[PDB]
From a paper:
Deubiquitinating enzymes (DUBs) cleave peptide- and isopeptide-bonds downstream of ubiquitin. Due to the similarity to the herpesvirus proteins, we refer to this extended enzyme family as VTD (for Viral Tegument-like Deubiquitinases).
To further elucidate the structural basis for VTD activity, we solved the crystal structure of DrT1-VTD2 (residues 300 to 520 of Uniprot entry A0A2R8QBC4) at a resolution of 1.90 Å and compared it to the ubiquitin complex of mouse cytomegalovirus M48, the only available structure of a herpesviral tegument deubiquitinase. The asymmetric unit contained one DrT1-VTD2 domain, which was completely resolved with the exception of residues 107 to 109 located in a protruding loop where Leu108 and Gly109 have rather weak density. In total, the structure contains four α-helices and nine β-strands, which adopt the form of an α-β-α sandwich, in which a bifurcated antiparallel β-sheet is flanked by α-helices. When the DrT1-VTD2 residues 403–411 were replaced by a short Gly-Gly-Ser linker, the enzymatic activity against Ub-AMC and di-ubiquitin was completely lost. Individual mutations of both residues (D376A and E377A) resulted in a strongly reduced chain cleaving activity, and also a reduced cleavage of Ub-AMC, the latter effect being more pronounced for E377A.
Numbering used by the authors: 0, 300 to 321, 601, 323 to 510
Write the structure that this text describes.
């Protein structure tokens, strides 16, 4: 795929240890709002996503701590904010019914399918979604010109592989064919992150209502 790389990733030391490397669900949500405003994001736009997403995480964490509802580190879909601000715009978040499945397994239950077949919903069924699997969250999308892609706020090489080197950055990867993106996502989840065939993934389609 084609790649746009940020200059850094969410574990960068510029983020306070309070939020460092815990912001991915917020970064994925912020990405989908910014990408909806403009598909052709530049590297500096992804940097801005990481900055605003970290700020959102810190605000939500503070809110739940004042309410005594903070125990774990990565915010789940239930703890995501209901409103989000980009550069100049503000949106209410519409959470749609979640989809669940397994990376490769397809239990005889029948209802839940594997990742490849579940993500077929991106052809028309929906355009923007958060994808959580094995404690890692990414954003997946179908863009205005019918391309498929995802945004990964973790430490990645330009081609989307995990790296522990300080050269790793967040990346957005864009594909002409959905099948190519599915293969890449399986390389990420099962190759780089070593997640097993029976690992469950959680898909949250989101839409945005502009409130200026």
């Amino acid at each position: 795929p084609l790649s746009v790389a940020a200059s850094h990733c969410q574990s960068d030391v510029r983020y306070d240890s309070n939020s460092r490397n815990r912001q991915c669900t917020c970064n994925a949500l912020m990405f989908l709002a910014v990408h909806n405003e403009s598909n052709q994001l530049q590297s500096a736009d992804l940097d801005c996503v990481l900055q605003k997403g970290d700020a959102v995480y810190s605000s939500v964490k503070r809110s739940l701590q004042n309410k005594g509802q903070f125990v774990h580190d990565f915010l789940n879909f239930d703890e995501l904010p209901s409103t989000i601000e980009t550069n100049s715009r503000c949106y209410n978040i519409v959470k749609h019914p979640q989809r669940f499945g397994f990376l490769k397994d397809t239990p005889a239950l029948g209802e839940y399918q594997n990742l490849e077949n579940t993500l077929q919903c991106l052809k028309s069924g929906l355009t923007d979604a958060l994808l959580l699997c094995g404690g890692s969250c990414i954003a997946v999308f179908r863009d205005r010109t019918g391309r498929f892609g995802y945004f990964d706020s973790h430490s990645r090489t330009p081609d989307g592989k995990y790296t522990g080197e300080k050269s790793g950055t967040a990346v957005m990867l864009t594909f002409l064919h959905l099948k190519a993106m599915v293969e890449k996502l399986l390389q990420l989840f099962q190759g780089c992150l070593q997640l097993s065939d029976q690992e469950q993934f959680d898909l949250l389609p989101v839409s945005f209502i502009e409130i200026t």
